[PDB]
Ligand binder design. Structure first.
Ligand SMILES: *[C@@H]1O[C@H](CO[C@@H]2O[C@@H](C)[C@@H](O)[C@@H](O)[C@@H]2O)[C@@H](O)[C@H](O)[C@H]1NC(C)=O
Ligand SMILES: *[C@@H]1O[C@H](CO)[C@@H](O)[C@H](O)[C@H]1NC(C)=O
Ligand SMILES: *[C@@H]1O[C@H](CO)[C@@H](O)[C@H](O)[C@H]1NC(C)=O
Length: 275
């Protein structure tokens, strides 16, 4: 019962920030393969990578060496300077009349729907937007409190790839409104980039990192398993263990929500039914 929705947002701009847009495009491919529909996936990506004069492969974005083109077919709801706090927060709330610029696609969800939000690109108490102002912890949590008050969702999972990512939720995110959050790092740690030049077996055409460590770890995990048999809690434990040497994967909010299979939010790719 209900519909799966998602909001994917890369909070940065500039070719050196290739990884944030590659991470978000990779998440789109997982949702598309799982049967989540484009009308229910709101994408915020600056869109300055695929056709950049510096990109050695125009029209292509990869999130791993030798990987597939993750840019192919990704919707463009909010690009360029339309990625900002006003539009990101109105999209989460689901109020089309509060969007200023962009497609107007928002989470106009119903009570049995599921929501998955993934943000990639931070400092204590804030995460980036392509231009100032940045998004502050209190303002993001206040929007989540407004969304909970409307009652227009069954449960929500929010994944954040950023430095000090846990600072967006620590001591603020409510625990009884069906919102579970997972962060690449805790409130006082930075997060790591990965797939950078100068590593064994790396495409010689690139001078930028292709992904972020926590992101490619959870994204590649989604690609390799039947999401009906892996829960959010099992992914938390697996990814937390895998990257313990770099940062402390952290969880906040309504922890029992993580008993849900990942397919509740992402669907599942029939090619991995045996895995
Ligand atoms: C949906 O949003 C409407 C527009 O909000 C107004 O415009 C935005 C851009 C901001 O300036 C905001 O402060 C304004 O209030 C509201 O008129 C409307 O009541 C909202 N609907 C619901 C159900 O919340
Ligand atoms: C390409 O990347 C450069 C470096 O960040 C940026 O200044 C420029 O705006 C981008 N151009 C396009 C066409 O996306
Ligand atoms: C964050 O993780 C580090 C370990 O890398 C730990 O020393 C620190 O106490 C943690 N901070 C919080 C607020 O939990």
């Amino acid at each position: 019962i209900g519909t799966r929705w998602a909001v994917l947002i890369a909070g940065s701009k500039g070719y050196h920030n290739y990884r944030h847009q590659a991470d978000v495009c990779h998440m789109y491919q997982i949702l598309r393969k799982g049967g989540v529909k484009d009308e229910n996936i709101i994408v915020f990506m600056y869109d300055d990578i695929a056709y950049n004069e510096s990109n050695p492969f125009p029209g292509i974005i990869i999130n791993k060496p030798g990987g597939e083109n993750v840019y192919k077919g990704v919707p463009k709801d909010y690009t360029g300077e339309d990625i900002n706090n006003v539009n990101f927060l109105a999209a989460i709330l689901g109020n089309k009349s509060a969007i200023i610029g962009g497609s107007g696609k928002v989470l106009d969800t119903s009570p049995n729907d599921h929501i998955f939000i993934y943000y990639a690109x931070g400092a204590p108490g804030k995460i980036g937007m392509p231009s100032k102002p940045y998004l502050y912890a209190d303002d993001l949590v206040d929007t989540l409190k407004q969304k909970a008050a409307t009652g227009t969702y069954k449960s929500m999972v929010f994944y954040v790839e950023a430095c000090n990512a846990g600072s967006m939720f620590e001591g603020l995110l409510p625990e009884g409104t069906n919102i579970y959050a997972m962060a690449a790092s805790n409130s006082t740690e930075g997060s790591w980039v990965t797939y950078c030049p100068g590593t064994p077996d790396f495409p010689p055409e690139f001078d930028v990192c292709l992904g972020d460590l926590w992101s490619i770890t959870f994204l590649e995990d989604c690609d390799a398993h039947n999401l009906r048999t892996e829960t959010v809690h099992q992914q938390f434990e697996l990814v937390k263990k895998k990257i313990a040497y770099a940062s402390t994967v952290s969880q906040y909010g309504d922890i029992p929500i993580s008993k849900d299979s990942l397919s509740v939010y992402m669907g599942t790719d029939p090619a991995n039914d045996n895995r």
